[model samples]
Target chain A: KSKFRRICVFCGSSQGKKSSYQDAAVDLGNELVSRNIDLVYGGGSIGLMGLVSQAVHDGGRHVIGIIPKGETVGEVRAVADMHQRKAEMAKHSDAFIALPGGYGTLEELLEVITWAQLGIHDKPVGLLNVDGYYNSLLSFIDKAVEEGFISPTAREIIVSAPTAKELVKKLEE
Target chain B: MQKSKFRRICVFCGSSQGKKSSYQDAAVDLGNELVSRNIDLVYGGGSIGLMGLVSQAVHDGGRHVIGIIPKTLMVGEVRAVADMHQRKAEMAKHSDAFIALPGGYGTLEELLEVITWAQLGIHDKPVGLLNVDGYYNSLLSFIDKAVEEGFISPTAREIIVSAPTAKELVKKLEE
Candidate 1:
């Protein structure tokens, strides 16, 4: 059996300014299809979210989504509120990989990380740092570690890479 | 009967006094500001760090304080919760607005949650950050990058209001 049955991805609903982000979504989706793993995601039908979902769907893999308020190897679950959504996302996934996104994506990413840091779950969390989009945030996290606010152990829980294949590979270990 | 737009403002800060002197100062400044505004406090009364400093200030100033104390190693006129999620829920449920002093993962997570809430129309409450010593400037810069890259909308980006001092930050939170 594979290490992951379904991997949850937290990403922006908006397509970013650069084509690299869009490409990364497709690349990640394509990687999942090759592994024959199902997709779990949080977002609507448009922007980078759907781009990933659409690519996965076309590859003939199942796409499961959690929305706060879809078909063809596609499914969407309606969650009662934001917290419910956050809880459910963790419940349904084997691991998490965050792509570039906004506040909503960051919040979801951190929520999962915070839980993992607290011993709530054993699932691994990864950051798909497409085109260095996550560099500044990574530096800020490092700064937190330097300031003694974050433990060095907590700091290492996150796995990051510049590409989808590399990130997925690192997470598998 | 709107005596003040805010009667309870939730403060998110570190449980350990940060490495810098300014971090401690901000916590006390925030507490003192609440008293001046006639606002009570809602927070984690950890009795240490910025959390400890701020809560004590509000209490000493006599505006009253409610602690959303988690059941683990928990005090205030305290209310207990089964989990961290519920503790934050309790803290947010009773507050008028939210503010953050410098903190780590937990603090950033809390600050981002309220911003996401406001962005999603789940709450109309304003969120502010006491930007001590440019601690959050890197975060702000990352956010601006997100906005520029279209990951975040321009209008939604305005949800985070910050000022150097607690007085200015609290006032900035309102308008």
Candidate 2:
């Protein structure tokens, strides 16, 4: 597999049930392909997962997928165990991006961000706000600062962009 | 910076540790297991609450620990003293698995991010909750309600949530 040249995305495995989420996913895929970047992500072929993967595929860019062995057996061929998935991803990726979705998407995005917070991997962790879908989450971070759970400086590192191009550009910067 | 294919486990935990002594025991126990299993520590690099406890335990157990600190808070938070990596970005990339203990927003936020990653199938690494002290019981119920309400698919729910013990939890990861 070729090394990922740019960003690695973490998003909802399901295509957001809404057209807006799908719309956003398509836009993001185009941005990635146009930017000449490579992709690293979970190996799902449906939903936003499928949309982004196929878009990049169509864009003629490189895609390296990391699939958990047993999740959605019909959708993805098992790649490796969880630990192996992380190692595989870290070994290749340059960045991690989070889009709107459910628990699984949220968890995947936060863990990478946590690693940034903890200093494990020195890569950018970005949030695609996509119509302010993560408004509550943004507020939660404010609360963390208020509660002293995290310092104000901790809040500064996470980059949030309203559009795919803006987010990608922020990472590129 | 040996570039030798290094792998580490990044765990999210509460600053208060746990109210019950059993939780403290579990914290140290986790550190011991990480050492015995030859996993390094990747965490907030703090010296407070369970953060400090686990960092201390991992060091005492003779395992390598790497703490990352943002430039602004290092002086005040009493950042962990160990092999250090200063994150230029808001997130880190060296993690293979994400496990959470019962905690406040910081812990929940970290847990939720990785869980989202799994849901999107962006990266299929496993995400887990320790659920110690039945701490996550209500949160789990709320997530179920979200799925039932059609916020996300039922499969998304299954992508996360594991049992109590570390062994069982690690075993459940799909990655």
Best TM-score among the predictions, by candidate number = 1
| Superposed Cα deviation of residue A64, candidate 1 (Å) | 1.5
Writing each residue's lDDT as its tens digit, candidate 1 over A60-123 gives 9888888775332388888887788889988999999999999988999998888888788979
What C-alpha lDDT values do all the predictions have? Answer: 0.87, 0.66
lDDT of 1: 0.87
For model 2, what is the error of residue A6's alpha carbon versus the real structure, in angstroms, after optimal superposition?
A: 2.4
Indicate which candidate wins on lDDT: 1
Residue-wise lDDT of candidate 1 within B1-175, one digit each (tens)? 3356998999988876878888898899999999988999999767888999999999999888998877985535888888778888888899999999988888889999999989989899989989898888889889988999998888988999989999899878767
Candidate 1 wrong stretches, greater than 4 Å:
A69-73, B1-3, B72-75
TM-score of 1: 0.95
- Model 2 lDDT per residue over B99-123, tens place: 7765665677666756755665666
